[PDB]
């Protein structure tokens, strides 16, 4: 939830010879004063934290989804395409090669 982000760390400010960022609070740790919170810091936030609504999702129009498939179905038998598709069959004959449904029972 708040990965990185976790010392009671504060920015040290200016006059201190240094870039003016948050730094770790505490001594001895020898994390002591080390840059804090964000992006650029060791173990820190990253820039842009990783959001929950990504649009991992969609609609598709129904006519369209289907329509598309529909083109595809034809092109499932537009043979060159099919061959081209990595499909090979030396066997190749009727495109599609239409088969007994009797096959289906084979156990």
């Amino acid at each position: 939830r708040l990965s990185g982000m976790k010392h009671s760390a504060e920015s040290w400010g200016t006059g201190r010879a240094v870039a003016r960022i948050p730094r770790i609070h505490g001594g001895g740790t020898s994390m002591s004063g080390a840059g804090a919170f964000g992006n650029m810091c060791r173990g820190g936030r990253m820039f842009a934290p990783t959001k929950i609504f990504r649009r991992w999702h969609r609609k598709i129009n129904l006519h369209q989804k289907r329509f598309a498939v529909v083109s595809a179905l034809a092109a499932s038998s537009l043979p060159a395409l099919v061959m081209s598709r990595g499909h090979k069959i030396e066997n190749v004959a009727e495109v599609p090669l239409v088969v007994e449904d009797g096959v289906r029972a084979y156990e």
């Binding site: 939830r1 708040l2 919170f37 936030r45 934290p49 959001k51 929950i52 609504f53």
Partner: protein
């Protein structure tokens, strides 16, 4: 920044309570939904299994139901109509045992409803099985035939025993206006009906003025 002429100043997610490195908080995504679907489904089915002798959906009335926008529509509404139930005859308590809803807060606005409903009621009943108990006499309601169903499994949807809708369809008419209607005035004239009410209304002109003009 880029030049593109697009749809002015927008986009939204970069607003309130979207928990940041802060915390907050009002969270309620739907991603659970697959699972949820399943949760509805898996359960639902699984429920059936358990219940199983039972026709599932419980008979309720049919209604025309609300509004203007709904003025013209019917839905099988909540409850029933004790009055109707009465009118078919049936002890409500008992009805509840049969699994036909009851109600009260159906105050029951008009006639039609009974009529329709008794038939609904009846119809279920026609399609009744009712299980008896053995040793005990089938008798009580005259509960019926052990093998007849199959009570179990097809839960049931009550819509089968008594269906939803009802409406009346009107047709072809070579005529009418000729008797009359071509004269029928509706260049306001059949507005008049409203008009009067409006116009004579409370704070409206015909009631106050006229009366005033009179004395």
């Amino acid at each position: 920044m880029p030049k593109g002429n697009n749809a002015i100043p927008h986009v939204h997610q970069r607003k309130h309570w979207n928990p940041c490195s802060s915390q907050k908080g009002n969270v309620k995504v739907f991603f659970n939904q697959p699972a949820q679907k399943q949760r509805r489904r898996r359960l639902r089915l699984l429920k059936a299994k358990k219940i199983f002798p039972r026709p599932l959906k419980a008979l309720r009335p049919q209604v025309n139901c609300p509004t203007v926008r709904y003025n013209m529509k019917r839905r099988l509404g909540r409850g029933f109509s004790l009055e109707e139930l009465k009118a078919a005859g049936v002890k409500p308590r008992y009805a509840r045992t049969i699994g036909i809803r009851v109600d009260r807060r159906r105050k029951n606005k008009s006639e039609e409803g009974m009529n329709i409903n008794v038939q609904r009621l009846k119809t279920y009943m026609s399609k009744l099985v009712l299980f008896p108990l053995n040793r005990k006499k089938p008798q009580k309601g005259d509960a019926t035939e052990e093998e007849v169903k199959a009570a179990t499994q097809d839960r049931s949807r009550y819509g089968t025993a008594a269906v939803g809708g009802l409406v009346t369809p009107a047709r072809e008419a070579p005529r009418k206006v000729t008797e009359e209607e071509s004269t029928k005035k509706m260049y306001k004239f059949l507005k008049k009906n409203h008009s009067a009410v409006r116009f004579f209304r409370a704070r409206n002109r015909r009631a106050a003025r006229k009366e005033a003009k009179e004395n």
